[PDB]
Amino acid sequence: KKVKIAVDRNPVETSFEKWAKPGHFSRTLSKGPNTTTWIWNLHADAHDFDSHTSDLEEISRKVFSAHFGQLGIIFIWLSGMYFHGARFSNYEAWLSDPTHIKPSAQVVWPIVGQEILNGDVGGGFQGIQITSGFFQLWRASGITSELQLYTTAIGGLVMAAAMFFAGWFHYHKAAPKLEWFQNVESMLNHHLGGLLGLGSLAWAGHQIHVSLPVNKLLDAGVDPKEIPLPHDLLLNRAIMADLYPSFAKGIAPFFTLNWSEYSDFLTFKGGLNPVTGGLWLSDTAHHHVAIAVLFLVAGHMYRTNWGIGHSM
Amino acid sequence: DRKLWAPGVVAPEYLKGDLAGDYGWDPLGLGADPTALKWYRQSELQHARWAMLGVAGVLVQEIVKPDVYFYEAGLPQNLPEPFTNINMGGLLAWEFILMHWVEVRRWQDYKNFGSVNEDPIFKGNKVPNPEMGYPGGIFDPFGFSKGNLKELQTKEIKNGRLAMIAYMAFILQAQATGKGPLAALSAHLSNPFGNNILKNIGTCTVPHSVDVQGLTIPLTCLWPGS
Amino acid sequence: QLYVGASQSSLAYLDGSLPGDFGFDPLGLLDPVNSGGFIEPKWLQYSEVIHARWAMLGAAGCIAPEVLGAAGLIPDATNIKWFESGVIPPAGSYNGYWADPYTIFFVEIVAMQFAELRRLQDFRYPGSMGQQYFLGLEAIFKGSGDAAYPGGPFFNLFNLGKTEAAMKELKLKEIKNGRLAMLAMLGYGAQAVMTGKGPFQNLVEHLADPVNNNILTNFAG
Amino acid sequence: FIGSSTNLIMVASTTATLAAARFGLAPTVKKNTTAGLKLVDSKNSAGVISNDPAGFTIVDVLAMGAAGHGLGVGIVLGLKGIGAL
Amino acid sequence: VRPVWFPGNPPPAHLDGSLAGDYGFDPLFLGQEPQTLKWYVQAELVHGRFAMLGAAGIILTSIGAKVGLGFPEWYDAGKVVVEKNNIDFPTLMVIQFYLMGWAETKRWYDFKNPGSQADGSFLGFTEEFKGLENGYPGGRFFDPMGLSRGDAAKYQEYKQKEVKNGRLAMIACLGFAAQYAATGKGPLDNLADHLADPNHVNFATNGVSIPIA
Amino acid sequence: MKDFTTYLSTAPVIATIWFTFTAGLLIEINRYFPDPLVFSF
Ligand code: CLA
Ligand code: CLA
Ligand code: CLA
Ligand code: CLA
Ligand SMILES: CCCCCCCCCCCCO[C@H]1O[C@H](CO)[C@@H](O[C@H]2O[C@H](CO)[C@@H](O)[C@H](O)[C@H]2O)[C@H](O)[C@H]1O
């Protein structure tokens, strides 16, 4: 196998000893300060890995675990936005009147008079009116409860710990070799296929099974505590057939290629939903389905270990 | 030691046939320590002898009277005529002290073999104790020992193990159907297809509590399901 | 080699030992050069064995209450499907156990931390598990060189496979029924999601009308 | 469905690719295509031990079954969109 | 060769078997330095001492409840003795802090200097506050029965038994608070609730321990 | 963890512990003593 897993076991010993020595990465900065330019060169040359060493394998290992550090920080960030949307928000109120209640997800502590920033955003709530658009994401995902926001915040903390452990593992315990990184055909096949293709197929699954029925019941006008939970939308095909009457035919039109019968919930409407001013979620559903098929086709392009495929 | 518990098994190293009833057994490693093996030998002898008493009590009390049932034979209502509705506290006091004597004498025979043989009140005749768990002397009033002690020792252990399985049978064929052992044997011999282990396991005829003169005893079966 | 789908790259090192070997490694996960982590060949063989015997216990145990209720040997209260046992309470929970399923689950937690961390500490530390006091029972747990096959006086009760060739045949046949039963568990789960019926009821419905009741006529047409 | 106008497109479009790659009319694992459009021998990057005489591996089966399903889905849905079936 | 908290894993290097109740349990390497470990041995001891006193306190005052005596529960005994007995509360707190600040700073400057606190600077006591080792002061006051001298092997046995009972009394005092923050009643009422029905009156049916009820 | 305590004694870590200390001291003061414009008694 030319394309194969190839790592190195225990390359870098996990120790706080080099945290005690600032400038350990640099040949010039390791002697310590004599001059305040040292402490700016410490922070400027900190992530310039190509100037630390000349070994491209070590540079690739450092930049592959720094990406797990960035991913763990993004999962801390996303999980914090879900947590602040759960515990400090008017999102429960915002779902009942999303035209007269301002989206707020940041509340300040009343100390030095800064509690004037807790303005009257509506829904019996005081906080800072957010503008990052998370409440519209959460309506488009079919959340309808701050319990789901709290649990995906806990899942984001778990996934951030997974990313931090992953960077620790793939730098300190089992770090990949150089010719692992140089398999760009396999990286493109897996990223077009698995990241982009399977990710939009999975979001197509969430849009077909969760967000289309929940947002259809919202647009018809139903209280969010009256809407069936989305696990009661997975298990009960009868509710989905009440909402979209081609779920009664099952996945039989998909394998008999009678896909036009799926036109109840995969559409090509275009324009806007006049109830809510957004895109039709059946249209975005068929969008991510077609994007998924396209990128799963595109991720079978490059030659890795069998003679089929292109080499770049 | 030979003719082990299964045909194709190698015996453990600590089971070379010195003890009686030795079948190359212990597939859970419990006798691997010698001081643990002597105590487990003593506890097997204790469970064997009390289980033989249990079997020869349960299948004799229904021979002499097949009306008083052995499960509730411990209730004061079911005791015989000179002991009916006795205070069970005083009876428990008699049993507690008269057993805390005997069992601690036997325990100190375990902890220091040979130091407990003399009658302590009557500083005279001892008990000739050849090996641990087999005192003799006055525990052989008929003198069936002082012959082939290994033969009768294997006989005692085999009848004792069979009586252990028999007595834990006698309880479980009485929790499922609420019926004595000879009476459950007669119930099998009546209809040997609906009065078996099938359609009797799963029910527990034991009540949850019985008030014995003011005390409630928890009274559990060994499997779930009433 | 056997099992077409095998390649030449998964055949040079892969010699003929390592029981259940047929060369079928089309991705080359088991490959000793530059390996590491959980893609070590020892961990992969060990986890195939563990997945194998858990799945064959599960493959007997999903089909057993429905078969034994088809014979009437167990009552109809315990004739339930495997996914309605309480493992998936959205699919259905049997309420006639002796406890809450979370009581039973905490008992399972304690029993399986003791069953599994001990199981791992002989993979990590092969000489261990007979050293500390564990109620005298540590004489069982000495194991052997191979972590997937300890074979003490308990794990190899009847001492089956005395000779080396019979032991290799038994290690082969265990993996054979284990791979068949891993596929059987995959075809219990994916076949109980799609149908909604038990595996034995799927077998009875396939033996009733094989053409009109199969995978093709189960897409709810 | 069996014998209908959509089954006959799908089977005859999958078996067409499975007979194309075997009989030298489509690229395989063992055989690729040059900078022009000429059918040339490969390196295969692992070596195959296929007992089949043309080296037609199961990887070729998956590749040309995916290609035949792609051509069949394209022809079936295009004939549904053109009106003629 | 000695028993470890997690069988298989070797004990760490700073934790050879010489302390009472040693089982190699330091995954976070907090007592890696010998002097910080010297301080945490003292801390584990005195937390165990107060937890053994506290656990015996809760268990005795809860045997006092539910049998028929007038004793309160342990979470109610703070109010009932400052209200039944006319006790001003912040002066009871300040008297506690005075007496125990004395008794604690004596120990705190025994740790900083082991031969100190014994020069008769106190009311004329020289050997009685000498201190035998870390967390085991001894002498005529802290060991009036004199069990730290005599048979030394039985004294090491008592050291390990003290540490064992202290560990599970710390666990019990962490558990009384959780039994009260979960159920809201007495600990020996929780025991009799677990004994009247062994199933269904455990922690998994309390609604608070597992949220997936 | 001697190297961890030397890391805890570096300049930015001492800076971010001491500034949280002197921040959360003045913040608790301005909670328990609201709005001090003038030195009162
Ligand atoms: C189908 C397989 C697959 C998938 C899904 C990914 C996905 C990813 N790779 Mg990647 N990669 C793959 C195969 C795959 N890779 C192969 C085969 C190679 C070797 C040729 C590489 C080499 C490679 C490098 C060198 C780098 C990446 C990076 C990334 C990340 C890009 C950032 C992003 O979009 O975040 C999207 C975020 C998510 C999708 C969150 C979900 C997280 C999932 C669970 C982890 C990703 C799937 C993982 C590969 C499965 C392995 C599980 C593990 C237990 C073995 C992304 C997580 C970059 C990165 O950020 O590294 C951390 C990076 O530097 N990849
Ligand atoms: C409690 C009763 C008891 C005890 C203490 C022993 C003790 C002993 N037996 Mg023994 N045995 C018993 C009952 C008992 N036996 C019964 C009922 C049978 C018939 C099946 C046998 C058959 C038997 C054979 C054939 C041999 C022994 C041997 C031994 C010795 C070595 C094994 C060892 O170390 O185990 C120590 C045992 C324990 C520490 C007790 C553990 C009990 C566990 C925890 C519970 C049992 C599980 C379960 C509830 C049992 C269900 C019974 C029910 C279905 C009736 C040891 C002296 C060997 C011997 O004589 O070597 C000299 C030997 O060859 N035993
Ligand atoms: C950017 C993403 C990324 C990439 C490219 C890699 C790449 C690699 N990892 Mg790594 N890893 C990652 C993220 C990533 N990892 C994360 C997030 C973790 C923490 C959970 C780990 C933990 C980890 C360990 C512990 C090990 C590796 C190993 C490996 C190597 C071989 C992996 C392999 O064959 O898996 C192929 C895939 C599998 C074996 C299946 C894994 C099962 C997963 C959980 C299911 C699929 C996940 C899917 C993407 C999303 C869930 C689907 C679900 C929603 C339906 C390779 C160097 C191994 C190695 O050789 O050491 C270097 C190894 O031992 N990684
Ligand atoms: C003989 C069999 C047959 C028949 C009769 C049809 C018939 C049809 N196909 Mg079709 N198809 C077939 C085989 C067949 N196909 C096969 C084998 C495949 C697999 C490759 C496809 C894949 C396929 C797709 C993916 C689509 C069709 C569509 C269509 C329908 C409308 C096409 C049209 O007018 O768009 C004319 C439209 C344009 C010319 C606009 C093109 C502009 C694009 C969007 C942007 C291009 C981006 C960029 C600039 C590209 C640069 C690269 C380029 C230079 C190569 C038509 C009924 C379409 C459909 O379903 O519509 C309802 C559709 O989207 N077909
Ligand atoms: C390991 C497994 C890999 C994945 C395998 C995927 C399955 C293969 C794709 C489907 C093959 C043909 O697809 C299709 O043919 C069958 C005909 O027999 C259809 O079967 C049925 O079709 C209609 C209802 O749906 C009815 O009018 C037909 O009476 C009935 O035969 C199935 O609806 C469909 O599945």
Side-chain angles (χ1 to χ4, degrees), chain A residues 252-253 255-256, chain C residues 211-212 214-217 219-221, chain D residues 1-2 7 69:
Chain A
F255 291 101
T256 57
Chain C
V211 175
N212 295 117
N214 55 0
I215 176 62
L216 283 314
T217 317
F219 292 102
Chain D
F1 184 80
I2 299 294
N7 206 164
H69 277 76

Side-chain angles (χ1 to χ4, degrees), chain A residues 1-3 255-260 303-309, chain D residues 1 6 10 28-29 32 44-46 59-60 63 73 76-77 80:
Chain A
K1 298 291 179 67
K2 186 62 68 178
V3 172
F255 291 101
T256 57
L257 297 178
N258 289 318
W259 293 357
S260 63
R303 180 168 71 244
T304 61
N305 280 322
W306 300 270
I308 60 172
Chain D
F1 184 80
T6 62
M10 287 294 294
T28 59
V29 171
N32 288 118
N44 310 320
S45 294
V59 174
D60 287 331
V73 167
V76 166
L77 292 169
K80 291 183 186 295

Side-chain angles (χ1 to χ4, degrees), chain A residues 64 67-68 71 159 163 180-181 183 187 190-191 194-195:
Chain A
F64 179 63
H67 291 174
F68 287 113
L71 286 182
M159 197 65 209
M163 287 297 174
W180 187 76
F181 292 100
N183 290 316
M187 199 184 300
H190 286 86
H191 286 171
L195 200 158

Side-chain angles (χ1 to χ4, degrees), chain B:
Chain B
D1 187 69
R2 295 177 181 175
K3 295 180 177 66
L4 304 175
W5 63 277
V9 173
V10 178
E13 188 177 0
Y14 57 90
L15 295 179
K16 291 182 261 73
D18 289 330
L19 293 175
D22 196 357
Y23 277 154
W25 207 50
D26 196 5
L28 205 139
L30 298 172
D33 187 73
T35 64
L37 183 61
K38 293 181 182 180
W39 177 258
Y40 293 158
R41 178 66 166 176
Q42 291 303 113
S43 62
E44 192 177 21
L45 287 174
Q46 291 304 110
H47 282 92
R49 293 186 176 103
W50 287 108
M52 288 182 281
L53 265 72
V55 171
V58 170
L59 58 82
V60 172
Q61 71 92 30
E62 62 186 359
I63 292 296
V64 68
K65 50 182 181 181
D67 198 0
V68 178
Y69 182 58
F70 75 101
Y71 196 85
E72 289 89 5
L75 299 184
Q77 289 76 239
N78 293 319
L79 265 72
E81 188 178 3
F83 297 105
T84 301
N85 288 316
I86 197 63
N87 205 161
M88 296 296 289
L91 181 60
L92 192 275
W94 280 103
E95 181 183 358
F96 174 73
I97 288 175
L98 274 305
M99 288 300 292
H100 202 286
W101 179 262
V102 166
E103 283 273 2
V104 173
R105 297 284 291 172
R106 184 183 62 83
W107 179 72
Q108 191 55 41
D109 194 9
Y110 173 75
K111 300 294 286 183
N112 193 359
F113 180 74
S115 294
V116 177
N117 292 115
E118 295 178 353
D119 191 348
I121 296 170
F122 294 151
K123 294 289 185 70
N125 47 8
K126 298 181 177 67
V127 167
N129 193 0
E131 60 179 358
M132 188 181 288
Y134 300 97
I138 199 167
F139 298 99
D140 288 332
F142 290 167
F144 287 164
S145 179
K146 293 183 261 73
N148 195 359
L149 195 276
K150 185 75 172 179
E151 182 72 23
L152 294 167
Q153 189 172 359
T154 55
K155 290 178 184 292
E156 188 172 16
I157 297 163
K158 288 183 182 179
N159 283 299
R161 289 168 180 171
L162 184 60
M164 295 185 199
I165 294 174
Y167 190 76
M168 284 296 110
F170 290 171
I171 284 178
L172 296 183
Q173 331 199 32
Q175 291 179 355
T177 182
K179 193 180 264 78
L182 293 172
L185 181 61
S186 296
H188 179 67
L189 293 177
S190 297
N191 190 4
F193 292 99
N195 293 117
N196 53 2
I197 181 68
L198 306 177
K199 297 178 291 296
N200 287 321
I201 195 68
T203 183
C204 172
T205 64
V206 177
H208 184 74
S209 295
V210 168
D211 185 72
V212 179
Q213 296 176 355
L215 287 173
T216 64
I217 288 94
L219 294 175
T220 315
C221 279
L222 280 311
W223 69 92
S226 180

Side-chain angles (χ1 to χ4, degrees), chain A residues 19 35-36 39-40 56 61 88 108 123 128 130 133 142 148 151 169 202 209 217 275 291 297:
Chain A
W19 302 20
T35 283
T36 58
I39 79 167
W40 302 112
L56 184 62
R61 290 172 180 174
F88 304 106
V108 307
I128 299 171
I130 61 164
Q148 285 89 251
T151 56
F169 186 76
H209 294 288
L217 290 173
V275 181
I291 284 300
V297 168

